[PDB]
């Protein structure tokens, strides 16, 4: 309440004539900025918002509550001066202009201005423009804490200064940094926005000094001895600059204290944790008394929708053929009606994010292990969506151009063979002409198929990106459930995507899978999908595996690139990091449960491109970065819990075997070793999604290359038609496969259903053996043991003979 009074007085000082409505407006704005600022969930926020206006009307009748209490309550001194109330849109335009200028200065990564960012920018600016105006920020990682803090600090002229924590970060290092920042703030009269994350706040040794600095205004005893003498010596020059001649040591120390209090604002960024925040309160009260705290958690639906709209403006997503379905599935209430195709795609992206929230909450209710889902994952998802869309569109355009070139070449050769007929050979020439006409009609059909794929590309890429970015930590069954939910949603929205889409085939090709199988990567479907995850990533992948096949596979894959192994526990880890960070080689890292926060700059991909040099701030040391640097984090323990900070900077790759993964693996092995015809038909069905088509296109390219050697010699026997009969029978075979695909699907489904109980028995038996370790410590069994038993049953079985 005393800060309430101070805020009202500060707002009323430059103004001289105010009706009662203005006073009530200022009072309500201060109530919003002091009480509802610190709340966590939506119900309490609504309670506070309604009670403020209820109290205002109860204790102040006869006034017009509309002007006095307006829902978009906002105050700023940027528009004109004197802390005048401002409408949201004018401030939006001003922030857009200043953010553009900021872009030309620093942090070229774009920002999307939804209402929440505007409010938080206003709050941070209000807190900064205040002596000893320290700030606490509580919110989920990636919500825009450090970015907005730095933006507001730069806007108000505050020079940001953030310490980089690492392993063996002794207290003396923080003492030296504190001395440096205090000298920079007080002595040189340079205002500082000092930003601290939670990684360095974990140790309680630093928090006591920071508590003293917060409360007293400057921690006593940080300067002592010759360093204290240098402090006073430079403080004399500081007083020289300001014309405040003083000679006694204590009085100039007090002047340094005043300068520090007036010119140092410290912003804390802390992840939401009830027990963690309780411990912080236990070790320090001034973090809640001296520091005013602002809560902003997960982005609202409007924020997600606006970010998706702004980050999908570059892509086409414009289908004039798209219609509006009846009962459009809307997760954003402010969608245009009727919506455009891009509108529907962004709505589907928002729905994907929200349904992953719902799935995570349900799995938490069930009692399993859950990983945090943050808006940084949403940005990663939208980046994967853009990249896959562009890549697939470029491939389709190149393939269509190749087909057009082939068609023109065939037309020219038809004209040439007509000219050569102008002059048994004639019958062969007629056969060649008919054959070329048939192949031309086939390429027209191929062009129609190209149009169909160009239609389905948008939804297919959306689902593929949603899988590659969001999922990865859940087991096979949960991945399938999420993919089915996304497919059903896109089916509701009339967004065209292939109904039998296969994730493994559309995100890779034959050569990559063959190379993976060359390394120690088993043909299990989970392993292939997670190899897909490992090939494409924006955030560095974190692999979890109780078996350790991941490490061998990933070292074999990158063995040609001088990959190295390193653990966190090894004291040379920083050592190895620096090497891999400058000489340009991948470095797989193990035992991530003992995570070292020193990797935070690397995972964040924050680099500084200055002086003809790219620099990474590895701890307190700046290191040259090489473009060929991919880092993989690994762990053998599969039940370990990760902090939300780590969970929001890496994509999880799960290799744990569950009741659904082993079931599918054993069913596939049964089909392969017992019904080879059914397994062959299933493989043909799976390869029909491009692989056969890719072979056909490669073969027609080979025909193009052979026909380019024509020179009249194409009529050696006047039938080069044998090669195109090979093509024609191959095309007839693939056409037959496509026509009868439904019958193949049905037969494979029936055979797999018949063989399923054996797979369920296999999974249950293996998990019973695995959980026998609780009966006695001697009963320890491995998955390879069960696979040996299973092979001894399937092969070398006398009874089956």
């Amino acid at each position: 309440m005393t800060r309430w009074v101070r805020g009202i007085f500060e707002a009323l000082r430059p103004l001289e004539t105010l009706p009662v409505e203005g006073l009530i407006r200022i009072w309500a704005h201060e109530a919003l900025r002091l009480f509802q600022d610190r709340l966590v969930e939506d119900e309490e926020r609504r309670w506070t918002d309604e009670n403020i206006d209820t109290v205002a009307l109860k204790h102040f009748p006869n006034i017009d509550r509309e002007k006095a209490m307006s829902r978009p309550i906002l105050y700023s001194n940027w528009l004109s001066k004197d802390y005048i109330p401002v409408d949201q849109e004018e401030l939006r335009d001003y922030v857009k202009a200043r953010l553009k200028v900021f872009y030309e200065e620093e942090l070229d990564v774009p920002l999307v201005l939804f209402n929440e960012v505007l409010d938080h920018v206003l709050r941070i600016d209000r807190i900064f423009r205040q002596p000893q105006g320290h700030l606490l920020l509580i919110g989920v990682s990636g919500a825009g804490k450090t970015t907005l803090s730095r933006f507001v600090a730069w806007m108000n002229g505050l020079s940001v200064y953030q310490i980089k924590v690492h392993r063996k970060y002794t207290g003396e290092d923080f003492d030296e940094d504190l001395r440096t920042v205090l000298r920079r703030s007080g002595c040189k009269n340079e205002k500082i926005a000092f930003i601290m994350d939670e990684s360095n706040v974990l140790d309680s040794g630093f928090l006591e000094r920071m508590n003293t600095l917060l409360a007293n205004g400057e921690v006593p005893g940080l300067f002592e001895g010759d360093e204290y003498a240098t402090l006073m010596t430079q403080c004399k020059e500081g007083a020289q600059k300001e014309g405040l001649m003083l000679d006694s040591h204590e009085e100039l120390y007090k002047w340094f204290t005043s300068q520090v209090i007036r010119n140092l604002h410290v912003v804390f960024t802390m992840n939401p944790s009830s027990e963690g925040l309780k411990d912080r309160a236990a070790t320090s009260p001034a973090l809640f008394n001296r520091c005013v705290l602002n809560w902003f958690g997960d982005w609202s639906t409007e924020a997600l929708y606006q970010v998706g709209k702004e980050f999908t403006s570059k892509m086409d997503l414009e289908k004039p053929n798209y219609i509006v379905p009846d009962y459009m599935p809307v997760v954003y209430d402010k969608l245009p009606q009727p919506p455009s195709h891009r509108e529907a795609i962004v709505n589907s992206c928002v729905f994907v994010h929200q349904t992953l929230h719902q799935a995570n909450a349900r799995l938490a209710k069930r009692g399993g292990r859950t990983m945090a889902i943050t808006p940084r994952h949403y940005l990663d998802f939208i980046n994967h969506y853009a990249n896959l869309f562009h890549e697939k569109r470029s491939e389709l355009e190149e393939q269509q151009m190749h087909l057009n070139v082939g068609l023109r070449k065939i037309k020219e050769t038809v004209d040439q063979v007509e000219e050569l007929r102008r002059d048994a050979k004639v019958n062969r020439s007629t056969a060649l002409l008919k054959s070329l006409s048939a192949e031309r009609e086939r390429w027209e059909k191929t062009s129609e198929t190209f149009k169909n794929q160009m239609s389905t590309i948008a939804g297919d890429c959306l689902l593929s990106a949603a899988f590659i970015a969001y999922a990865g930590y859940f087991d096979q069954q949960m991945r399938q459930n999420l993919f089915t939910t996304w497919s059903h949603h896109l089916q509701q929205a009339n967004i065209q995507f292939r109904t039998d889409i296969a994730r493994t085939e559309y995100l890779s090709n034959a050569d990559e899978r063959l190379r993976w199988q060359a390394s120690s990567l088993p043909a299990d479907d989970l392993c292939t999908e997670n190899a897909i995850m490992l090939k494409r990533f924006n955030r560095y992948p974190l692999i979890i595996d109780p078996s350790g096949q991941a490490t061998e596979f990933i070292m074999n894959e990158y063995k040609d690139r001088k990959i190295t192994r390193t653990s966190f526990l090894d004291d040379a880890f920083r050592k190895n990091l620096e090497s891999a960070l400058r000489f340009g080689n991948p470095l797989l890292v193990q035992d991530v449960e003992s995570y070292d926060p020193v990797l935070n700059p690397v995972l964040n991909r924050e680099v500084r491109r200055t002086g003809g040099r790219v620099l990474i701030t590895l701890g307190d040391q700046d290191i040259d970065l090489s473009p060929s640097f991919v880092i993989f984090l690994s762990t053998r323990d599969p039940t370990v819990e990760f902090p939300p900070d780590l969970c929001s900077r890496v994509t999880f790759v799960n290799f744990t075997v569950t009741r659904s993964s082993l079931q599918s693996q054993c069913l596939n092995e049964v089909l392969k070793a017992e019904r080879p015809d059914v397994d062959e038909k299933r493989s043909d069905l799976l390869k029909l999604q491009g692989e056969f088509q890719l072979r056909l296109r490669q073969l027609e390219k080979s025909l193009l290359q052979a026909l380019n050697e024509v020179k009249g010699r194409i009529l050696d026997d006047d039938t080069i038609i044998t090669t195109l009969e090979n093509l024609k029978r191959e095309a007839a075979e693939v056409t037959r496969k496509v026509e009868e695909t439904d019958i193949v699907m049905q037969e494979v489904e029936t055979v797999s259903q018949q063989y399923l109980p054996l797979s369920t028995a296999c999974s249950s038996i293996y998990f019973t053996m695995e959980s026998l370790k609780q009966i006695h410590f001697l009963y320890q069994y491995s998955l390879q043991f069960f696979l040996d038993i299973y092979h001894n049953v399937l092969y070398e079985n006398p009874n089956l003979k």
């Binding site: 030309e104 001088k562 050592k575 620096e578 090497s579 400058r582 000489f583 340009g584 080689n585 002086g611 003809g612 040099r613 790219v614 040259d624 970065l625 090489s626 473009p627």
Partner: protein, 223 residues
């Protein structure tokens, strides 16, 4: 007429383009270049639509738009990573003959940077790798010319050396980094310096490994 007016405006725009291109590349500022490009674009947009429909105006507008989109490549090339060896190398690949002292933005704008984007980006990455290695060599030199032995008095009888652990960690860090630096093919440049530094580091390693044992035995037998 209107054609004469648009021809005069085109001549003025071309004169402005030539004047900004006469600035030598040594004295060109990428940020100011981008600002001037934006100003020229704004000036072009101020022309009437009748003058804007002319083919020559469209050609100049698209040329300046190409300059705008390659401004990022100009910024990347305007590093110190380029040295002159990479400039010589790109000269050899692009088969152009320039003078480093007489180098200005004009000749390189005549060269299609967009068409040669792959080569330019390869040159940039090569330059960044070589600068990483050279900066590492500068760092090792400056730490190993400024490192001092931590001498401490002993019983008023001698002045022994402490801090063996930190010095040994530094030596092993540097020897392993240099040994791993043989890979990363960019090592083909600055190889004799690397070999000399490795030899010096190995000499330090052996000398101080013997030194620590001598000091320990001597202090024990002294006691």
């Amino acid at each position: 007429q209107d054609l004469k007016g648009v021809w005069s405006e085109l001549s003025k725009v071309w004169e402005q383009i030539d004047q900004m291109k006469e600035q030598p590349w040594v004295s060109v500022q990428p940020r100011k270049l981008r600002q001037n490009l934006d100003a020229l674009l704004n000036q072009l947009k101020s022309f009437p639509a009748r003058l804007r429909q002319y083919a020559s105006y469209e050609f100049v507008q698209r040329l300046l738009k190409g300059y705008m989109k390659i401004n990022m490549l100009v910024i990347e090339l305007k590093s110190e990573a380029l040295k002159d060896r990479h400039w010589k190398q790109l000269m050899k690949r692009l088969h152009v003959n320039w003078v480093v002292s007489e180098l200005t933005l004009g000749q390189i704008w005549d060269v299609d940077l967009q068409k040669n984007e792959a080569i330019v980006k390869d040159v940039l990455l090569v330059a960044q790798g070589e600068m990483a290695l050279e900066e590492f060599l500068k760092q090792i030199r400056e730490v190993w010319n400024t490192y001092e032995l931590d001498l401490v008095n002993y019983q008023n009888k001698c002045r022994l050396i402490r801090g063996w652990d930190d010095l040994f960690n530094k030596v092993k860090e540097h020897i392993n980094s240099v040994s791993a630096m043989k890979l990363s093919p960019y090592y083909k440049v600055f190889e004799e310096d690397a070999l000399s530094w490795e030899d010096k580091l190995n000499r330090i390693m052996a000398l101080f490994d013997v030194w620590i044992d001598v000091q320990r035995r001597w202090v024990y037998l002294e006691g």
